[PDB]
Write a protein that binds this ligand. Structure first.
Ligand SMILES: [Cl-]
Ligand SMILES: [Cl-]
Lengths: 409, 409
């Protein structure tokens, strides 16, 4: 069985020689020193719970049963496998996410970090996790790689795409001040967190205005946003090769009512995985270049495919900087010395029967450093009892420092 | 300036020290031994014309002006670049293609070879070519990388997709014997090269029946084939990063007449690049796994995305073996000791004014070895005055021998 390593060779799964037995005191997967006092193999996982969801585990016979171990079983069973993951980044991500999940007493949390220039997954973590070196008393719900198996309505994180589309289609000018007074579609209330009489395009992102974006959406054909979200990869498979990998939920509708058109512009009526959202934000970070994702190491250059005009995406990335500046909702994500471009917010959870219950997903997505993004990051916190904004700041701050990126502000 | 090498480090572009001069006998990009008898740089291209279209060239100042030299100019100007190309494969491909173009007195020819498991471009060649070590008296028409810049109607090469779709949608059973008598749609004649009263699904591919496939097409909604050809990458960008890279021509039609529906099933009303066709055939070879292409070296595994059910594609690949067996139109492509799965044929050329003239494109596309494809190959011969079938055999035979693939038949 081949070794799974991180992108620089750091060991993440290593086969370890153990003996089997086919006396009463010793015996009551046997250690070498105890078999002699009286052939098979087992796996050792040096990062343990830090990368458990991604790497998975094998069974008694050394067959892969979950995660990378199962997904690349034939490759491993006989080559090594260098993942795209950077273990320093993985460990810091896990640390911040795990402790944030604990502090807010949430059900779970997930974090994905993507290299903007390559499509590489540099970190992929969830909490609660489990120790793959000892699978015992670990509940099934703590084992899912939620970054790829769980889905949620992306809410405000789609809003930058609404502004890009609307500028692109001449529905609005960079000049424009929008009427953002709350209003009704039938009896459906469209309103923001607070009341704002009017806003700038920047303001529409800065205050995350649902009113603002719904008016942009209704000024264009229903097909516009369907086209833009798809270009950014929403509703499309992420293709890592991982078992349990999901492709979200995506409308397949020719005819849209007015309210549906409005709620699409603020991220309802579709669902994403944390990983698809990371890929949205990597396509924002490259200023409109779509690149396929990879959990295995990849050498640059990766040309990818331009799906949206650079100048439009640069403009909107600038607008997004306001979210993490005073007055913006993501102010708690700010990093001393760095420009960041983020969206933060909230989506109501779906219950057992598929009906909304009173519990929330909190999410922060973004790229840094804003003057030329290198990393796309997504932080999702499930049912904590801008909860995700500080976590994003702490994680992204660590990433920038570890990777020696020149301060920006 | 970085070195461009092949996938194993073989040099394909190397910077060479030359001096400049800012006497009457010597001088009349100066050699080192002559500058001393009395600082800048220039490029040397060891494979010369073999890889000229792909690699391109630089100008006096060492700026990239065509091909890889221009496409990856910023990367090179300072890193080396390992292409996906294997120079042994490139050289044999060029040799067979160049001599075939000469022998049939054709305007040009093009050949693309793709690794079925990785998306890698292993060979990309055209003829006539030119020597990039001396750009002088070389006409502009000999400089285009036609594999990516030229487009043609794919004709019979789409037919295997028609059969896959129709089996998949239950329009036909593997059992079925089809009425393949020539017929009219309005006054439009639908007929094959020769008359066949009836054919098996295999027979429909073996004899490349336009009648057969048009009946399959008309038995299904016009959207079916539009969907299948797109899954295989037709009408979609190839994303190598190469300047002049084209994405073919692709219908954008809600309403199809009967004749249009028929001619789509035998490969008219769209146009492809040799490279897009290579990617179609690589997706056939993987039994329905779509993988993005790469001119740079890529490490396995590459999961890609399943776009069509394996069992259907395996079935049709088997049917395709008949084309290169006695009775099939591609019999001259047969390789002693190997099973191959191919389509061969002809498309009428478009003239200056966009009207059909009496000149032809001949093409052979396929995968080998049929029992588990490793290579997808496309050979296109432009305006020779199954012309491409022997060339395919000779090229693919060389590839299989060079790569040490176990005989198959
Ligand atoms: Cl849940
Ligand atoms: Cl021509």
């Amino acid at each position: 069985r081949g070794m799974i390593t991180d992108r620089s060779g750091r060991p993440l799964a290593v086969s370890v020689p153990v003996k089997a037995i086919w006396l009463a005191n010793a015996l009551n997967q046997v250690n070498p020193d105890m078999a002699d006092y009286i052939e098979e193999s087992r796996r050792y996982y040096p990062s343990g719970e830090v990368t458990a969801h991604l790497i998975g585990f094998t069974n008694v016979d050394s067959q892969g049963i979950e995660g990378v171990e199962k997904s690349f079983d034939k490759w491993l069973t006989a080559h090594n496998l260098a993942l795209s993951i950077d273990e320093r980044l993985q460990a810091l991500v896990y640390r911040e996410l795990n402790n944030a999940v604990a502090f807010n007493k949430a059900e779970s949390g997930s974090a994905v970090l993507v290299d903007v220039n390559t499509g590489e997954v540099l970190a992929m973590a969830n909490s609660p996790s489990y120790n793959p070196n000892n699978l015992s008393g670990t509940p099934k719900e703590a084992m899912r790689n939620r970054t790829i198996t769980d889905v949620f309505e992306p809410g405000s994180t789609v809003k930058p795409m609404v502004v890009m589309t609307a500028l692109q289609r001449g529905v609005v000018r960079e000049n424009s001040v929008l009427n953002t007074i709350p209003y009704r579609i039938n009896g459906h209330e469209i309103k923001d967190v607070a009341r704002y009489s009017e806003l700038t395009l920047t303001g529409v992102l800065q205050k995350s205005s649902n009113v603002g974006v719904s008016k942009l959406a209704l000024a264009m054909p229903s097909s516009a946003l369907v086209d833009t979200y798809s270009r950014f990869g929403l509703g499309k498979a992420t293709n890592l090769g991982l078992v349990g990998e999901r492709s979200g939920l995506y409308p397949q509708k020719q005819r849209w009512s007015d309210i549906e058109r409005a709620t699409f512009s603020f991220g309802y009526g579709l669902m994403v995985t944390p990983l698809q959202l990371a890929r949205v934000y990597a396509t924002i970070g490259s200023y409109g270049i779509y690149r396929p994702l990879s959990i295995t190491k990849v050498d640059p250059p990766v040309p990818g495919e331009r799906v949206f005009p650079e100048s439009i995406v640069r403009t909107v990335v600038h607008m997004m900087e306001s979210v993490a500046l005073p007055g913006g909702g993501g102010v708690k994500a700010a990093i001393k010395g760095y420009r960041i471009a983020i969206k933060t917010g909230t989506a109501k959870k779906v219950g057992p029967d598929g009906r909304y219950i009173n519990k929330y997903i909190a999410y922060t997505a973004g790229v840094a450093p804003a003057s030329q993004p290198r990393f796309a990051l997504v932080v999702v916190i499930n049912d904590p009892q801008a909860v995700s904004a500080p976590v994003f700041g702490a994680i992204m701050g660590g990433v920038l420092r570890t990777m020696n990126i020149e301060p920006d502000a």
